Design a protein around this ligand. Sequence first.
Ligand SMILES: CC(C)CCC[C@@H](C)[C@H]1CC[C@H]2[C@@H]3CC=C4C[C@@H](OC(=O)CCC(=O)O)CC[C@]4(C)[C@H]3CC[C@]12C
Lengths: 6, 600
Amino acid sequence: EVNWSH
Amino acid sequence: NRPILFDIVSRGSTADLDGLLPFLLTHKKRLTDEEFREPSTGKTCLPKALLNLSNGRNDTIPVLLDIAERTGNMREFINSPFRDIYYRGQTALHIAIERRCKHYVELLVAQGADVHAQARGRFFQPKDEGGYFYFGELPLSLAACTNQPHIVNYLTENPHKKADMRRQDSRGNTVLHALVAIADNTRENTKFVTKMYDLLLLKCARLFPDSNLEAVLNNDGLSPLMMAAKTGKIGIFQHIIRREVTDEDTRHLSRKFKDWAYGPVYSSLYDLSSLDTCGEEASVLEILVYNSKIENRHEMLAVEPINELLRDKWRKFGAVSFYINVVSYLCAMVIFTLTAYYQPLEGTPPYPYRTTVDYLRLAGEVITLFTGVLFFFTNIKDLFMQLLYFIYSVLVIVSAALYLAGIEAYLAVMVFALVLGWMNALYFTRGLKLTGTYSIMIQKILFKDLFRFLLVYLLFMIGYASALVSLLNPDSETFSTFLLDLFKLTIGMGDLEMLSSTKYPVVFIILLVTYIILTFVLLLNMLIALMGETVGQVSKESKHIWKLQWATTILDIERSFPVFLRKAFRSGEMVTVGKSSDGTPDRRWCFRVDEVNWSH
Ligand SMILES: CC(C)CCC[C@@H](C)[C@H]1CC[C@H]2[C@@H]3CC=C4C[C@@H](OC(=O)CCC(=O)O)CC[C@]4(C)[C@H]3CC[C@]12C
């Protein structure tokens, strides 16, 4: 997955 | 000694390294020897040490650098790249930047780390091309794409080495291209994407006032704005189309200026140089309207200058040409209908002409042939550089050719052309608003759902009718006759008198009963249901589809005209918005919009 808040 | 070295570095213990320097000196073995390096990839000691560290402090890196300097292999060791398909190109600096360790980035650049090294391994490729993370294939682009302002700032302005913002990888994309390539419509992503994009743009303009950073184009030939439009990224496209710069030094590159204000009325002119072109280059509007499979194709068009530009173009010249075209097409079809109607039945084609009425028919024929050849040429030019119209033109020309050759068959195909000639007249209602949405919906349902339904019905019908024919006992001719009879019965007219030769008539009656039931009750009803639900699902989409259809017709009309005529009709006023750095005037095309605000 892709997470821009971590 | 490779396993021992790998274990030592992985552990992170400083003590174990003692003695390596004299060992290498005595054996004169470099740290880049095949034995020391891992055969699988090529990973050297530095990337392994950087990969596994604690709270950003490995504590072994300086010792490794000192040892490599003692040997005298720093140039080939500190930037030794990986091999193999997955991670080809990656260097130590890429790792250091990926791990959010400014300290190590500085320590690496200070010693001569290649700052422009390209990491084009299959791991770093676009998602559609079998990869995980695409970032521009550069350290600078990597830091810009991982939301690290400090790294970008230090890297760009460093005494030892500077990675210039205007730099292109193998694909040609620059840092702005990558920063648009990783953008997503999420608020969190866009919030930093826009900020970093603007920061980097201002820095590049500041350093180099002469050149423009968005002027650069990749191998594909697009720019960040055109690429954002093509890739369906509203978040950055809307922020680049309305970019306004308050700083006087960097105001030249702004895109939306204030013109004047009177009370609640505010009037600002946007810039549309790149946005709208007259054939000089590719335009954002053409790309966004004509390309297929765009994520937010409909939402993207709802921007302050775009919609008003379409409106103004529509008023200025869109409406007139549309009505002219539709009227001319209808008249041409009427002429074609008359020509076909007055085709002399007597004799054989071609028919000699020796009277004025013959010359009237000939005039109609030449008009029809001219129309067909014109449509054919337009379609062929489109293909070289409208499928139904292509069929119409090809059929017309073939009919004319067979008329010249001499055969009755031409009339058939000629008539068929006439059918198609009117069959698509409905599609000219597209331009109209009230009926154009209905025409678009009819075309949409006709091609997608009706293809599936017809293909589903054909085999079922033919096989079931063949079964019924096989049931009867008194055989291609019998089947040919019975099929016509059966289809006529399907229409609701005729009589089933043929069943006299059949044994067990009861089962034939039952089978015909079930056939009728399926054809009328279930199959026909499902077709009814599908239309009702699709329109409900696209109830809001009606305005979207209508707006897209209106845009495409307008742009087709605009494209049709030659370049100089487009120059004549080009929309927008040349407005001197400022003086460039040298002091010369800008004189840049722009388009004006005014709003009303009672809270300002
Ligand atoms: C329901 C949808 C998806 C299927 C389309 C229906 C057609 C496949 C049916 C409807 C009427 C049928 C036609 C009725 C009459 C004739 C002429 C017949 O040959 C003759 O001329 C002898 C009979 C006569 O002259 O009337 C051959 C089949 C054909 C084309 C039949 C074949 C199949 C047709 C075109």
